[PDB]
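Notebook B, p. 112. Complex prediction, attempt 2.
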Amino acid sequence: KKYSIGLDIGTNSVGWAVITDEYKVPSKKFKVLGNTDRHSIKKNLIGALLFDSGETAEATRLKRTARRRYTRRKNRICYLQEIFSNEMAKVDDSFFHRLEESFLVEEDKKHERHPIFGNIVDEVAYHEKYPTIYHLRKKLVDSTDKADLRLIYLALAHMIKFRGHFLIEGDLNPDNSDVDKLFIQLVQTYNQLFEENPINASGVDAKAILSARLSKSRRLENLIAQLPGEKKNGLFGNLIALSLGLTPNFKSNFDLAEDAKLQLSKDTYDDDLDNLLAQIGDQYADLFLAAKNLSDAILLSDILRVNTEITKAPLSASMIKRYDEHHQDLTLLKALVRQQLPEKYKEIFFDQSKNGYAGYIDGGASQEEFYKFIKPILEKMDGTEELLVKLNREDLLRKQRTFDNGSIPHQIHLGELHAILRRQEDFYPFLKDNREKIEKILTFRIPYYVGPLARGNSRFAWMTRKSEETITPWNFEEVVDKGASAQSFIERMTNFDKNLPNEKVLPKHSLLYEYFTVYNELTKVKYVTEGMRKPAFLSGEQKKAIVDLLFKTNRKVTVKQLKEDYFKKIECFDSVEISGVEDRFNASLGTYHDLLKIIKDKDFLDNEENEDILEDIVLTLTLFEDREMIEERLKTYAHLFDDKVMKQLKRRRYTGWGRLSRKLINGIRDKQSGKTILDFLKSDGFANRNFMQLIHDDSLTFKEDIQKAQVSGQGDSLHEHIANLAGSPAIKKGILQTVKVVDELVKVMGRHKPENIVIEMAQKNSRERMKRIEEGIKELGSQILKEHPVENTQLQNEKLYLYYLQNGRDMYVDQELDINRLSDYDVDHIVPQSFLKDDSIDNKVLTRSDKNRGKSDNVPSEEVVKKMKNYWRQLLNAKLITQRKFDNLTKAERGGLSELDKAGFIKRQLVETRQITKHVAQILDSRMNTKYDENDKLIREVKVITLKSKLVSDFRKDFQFYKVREINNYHHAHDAYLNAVVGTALIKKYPKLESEFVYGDYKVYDVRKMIAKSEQEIGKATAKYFFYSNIMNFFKTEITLANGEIRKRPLIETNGETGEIVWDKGRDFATVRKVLSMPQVNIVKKTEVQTGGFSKESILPKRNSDKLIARKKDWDPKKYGGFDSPTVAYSVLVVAKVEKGKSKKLKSVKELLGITIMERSSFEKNPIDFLEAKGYKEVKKDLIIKLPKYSLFELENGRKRMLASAGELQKGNELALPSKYVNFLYLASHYEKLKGSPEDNEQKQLFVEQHKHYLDEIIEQISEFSKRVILADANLDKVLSAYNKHRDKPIREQAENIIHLFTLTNLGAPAAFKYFDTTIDRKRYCSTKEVLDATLIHQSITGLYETRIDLSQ
DNA sequence: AAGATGAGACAATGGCGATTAC
RNA sequence: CUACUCUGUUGUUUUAGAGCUAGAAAUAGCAAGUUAAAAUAAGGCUAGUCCGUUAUCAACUUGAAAAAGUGGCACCGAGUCGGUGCU
DNA sequence: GTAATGCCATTGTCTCATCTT
């Protein structure tokens, strides 16, 4: 029995269906295991696996690095105590011991409750003498007297524990720290990036402006006032606003559609910066980097207020001044409030719940919340000067430990540490002996390229050891093989090219890469002069001349500079027109101009012998960021340069990686031509092929070379094949599940492999079209928006959007369209639906009658093209229409549609562009087909067909097999079935087109033979598959062309070459409808142990509740607080006995106990001991059942539940709504947006109106389903009541809201939903009792093989 | 008319506590 | 398009920073607050300045584990699958 | 006393209304 499998792979579901030769879904009897009376069940071979999305490893990575940081910080403190130990033992015996046990309460604390001195008197004296640690630090830096060793340790430990950032390398100096130098660097980067209309800031006094004590916005405005050519909303103004701490919007600066806001203080700035940079290119990356540096400088000046130089510790003195000012402002505030506003004093200083001062100090109230709370209070009170100016300047009652301290470099803390060590050096000899040791503890930082200092038991570590001793900050240089460690780092961090494995990818800023992309963008440029009247691609000599003369002289090349300074200057061409590019060249030779600015030797940059040297330099600067390792890897080229520019070269840094390798760009060579990819880009004769075309085109050896190396890089296991794929972990999980589903399906069919496996990979728009309309209108100059104003909400209508796209004019006739008579007007297709199924705006026009297109079934005639070509050219250059639409509109002037165009349409409909789909097909093909013959040829028994979603979607829309995702989860399985049907139909109808869809080595049939010329009526003497280029015409009974003639096709479609019936237009559509109507579809929720964090991360205060979880073994949460809300890994049905407490009373209980993630290892180590520790006795070990999340139970009347938890359930049933209601809902909800022909649209609308009683019937279906299964009668009553409340509303709205009503009945967790204004809150199933007497159903991945256990026992 | 800030609603399911009802 | 290394600042939690005056308390009037220690997934053995939140996971049999095995075919129907013949 | 009906969480984010430029 031959069969085929259809698959719909997604990130949260995998649809699957099995079809026969007559497009039927088999129904089979499957054995049922367990201990019930049901031994067989009938199931349809169609279903869908559902599963939670796979997660990325980012969060785990962050947590891991955080753990490492905490560990290493604690180790730093342990090092400091190790240095201090013997002399602290001589001074105080239990000092460090008291410091470690500071957290414990006095009952559990073995030593005195007072940490530092152990007696209350000395503690009071210390705190009064030093109320903050910065007081002690400033004293120890500015006092020559001998100090107590405990206080010295406190200062050093505070400076080491919170040591500051490492963003600045080397000693602190004005070149990389003062605001002025970084401002000059910012305007230098700005002028370098533009140079046309640059900003000159020679006169500015950046220090006096940026460091001045004023509000942020007023400082920004004051700096803008000093630059008359720039404004606050300019790019530079937005950069300064970003550097000062404001939230500037860069949307207007780059005309981006979506608003991109950046805030340096926000933790999510980097990925936001990566999104923005992705939109505008990485040329601005270093610009924003300089802004960040400038921000830190400004921040450092905001903290380093005490610049008077009378002290040696600027930071500690500044914190003292902040303390004093805080004290003054506090006492003044209390005085003013008590004087003027006696009432509400308690709300500010005692209440603490509403963000008062007590909330600012003792409650969870941030600085911005406290300021926001006290701003109106200060405004209302009198005598509040000198506090509001501080509040607006964000310097009122500041704490010493705030979010600003991230900007403090570690060289300052190092300075204060050096000062303290030097002051107390002679008094304590071991400080003199261990000065460099302590300094090394503060300054030592494990390099990125060394990584975890493991000894073989770390999956993430790679470093090499030159000894066998504990790595410390002092012996790191002589124990860590930095050379070998850096080499391993290189070997690990080098990703391999997806096109060619086993070859390292070049850096993104490599010179050869920039040359490659520059030529790749330049080769798609076409020029038309005055006389030739036809587009001609640039020749090799032209490319070399333009590159050498223009691209090697300026960073930005625009079309105007290109035509003015090359074509007119050298080629003497007065007027040129360019279609390939829009405004400028996206590619650029950034690295070239960077190196030119560094070494200032233009001839050296163009010598082809020095290419490898420059590639080595860029690679070294890309891989590493540390100055020492860069100097080590750049020492070989010290003699080449003058050693002045070498310093500037070492300061340059590059980040990023490309996607292609050197061997692909300029390595592999065509055997016949003898030219590499780059050589083909530079020279290719008349026609110039781009990169993607060389990969696609089979006439060259490049495609063969890329294909033949794909299987070398692969591995042996399935896991390695899945890990090598290029996709998110979610789709990789879905792919693995798909493979397993295929394995089970071929097992179910008696180990018979299928014949075919068909695979499918499962307000902004209004803004884009609005910006498009506004730019087109502003460019043209017709003020249609003035006489007929519209908003982005109304622009969703097709006919109105087309009305505004066409300047309010008819496309075929020279007359204006009537704004308020669009119902009489028709929407025409530039390329008819009989040739290509393209219903986008790119191929649609609006006109009063589609008879104006003319009599031909092709593109519009030449008589209309000749009349309207000028107006279409004005709409073209005004960006109202695209280049392709203009090409299609004016195709009759060039003969009309051609065989190459029809072949392009066929390839557009039949080939899948996504690489991930091809790799999945490769995996399935390799796993399914594994036989050979005597020779070395692969026998392909199973064909893996790759299909596009558009085909099945159009199949649904054309024949009313409508999809409504909100009804149930059946649509995945249905999509898989329809994929199988369409795939099998296409492989049966057109076997010679196997190379388009089927994976593997096939004959590359040129499509020119297949396309029939001059309507040969698909003759049989010659092949002639089709005259009309639409592949899905044979499913249709009639074919309506663009003129109105209705062509007829036979009732039974058969293959021409083999005489096999491929589609019976009666029996097969009836079969498809019957399959779509089946109510039993196997929907399976993949059961999964829950993993991840133990609980909510919140560390809650102490409470009298046994739900609290201890943060450490001996930290009783009733005294110390802790975590609550643990996640249940899985539930465990246990049959056991418990003590009632009134007596022994071993009542035999049966209940689900949730094993939390934290408890899992202990429970699995020894379950019985764990359960006895929980209180259970005489546990029936053999009856314990492991129940992971989504475990399925069936109760009475087919009602089903899924396990969400140990104490909560989810809905387990699917609502098999009849097909007629699904189609009615789709039609009623899509009333205005039918997007079909007018007659067809009228038919659908009349069908909806004639069948409006289906609304009440659907409500009845939801009601009866809910009463049987859902059991939420309060919500059902709410629903029915709301439906009766809104029966007056239009049919469309009632349909749209019934769609929301199906959330009441959906499989999975209950969720709230809205019926018009009314909201129905979720009813949860917060009890697991009933499942203890239900039937548990263990399911295979396909759900076919079941095991039913009656838990009554 | 555009940009920024504040408030009311959405994500999105399960655990905790309170509540209420038998 | 994933994956990875180095690093910081906040935050939270207990304890320390003596509260003072009345009053049998309850509760009232005021003073004060900015800082610090320690933990920051419980923990693990392999004892490293390492690892612990990703991937993977129905049931049953054999195994410490990677992993191997276990479930008849047609026909008439179709409310979550039912019925009939052969085997 | 036991068993079935709103807030919080890595407290993010999006849209609408009002005020300011």
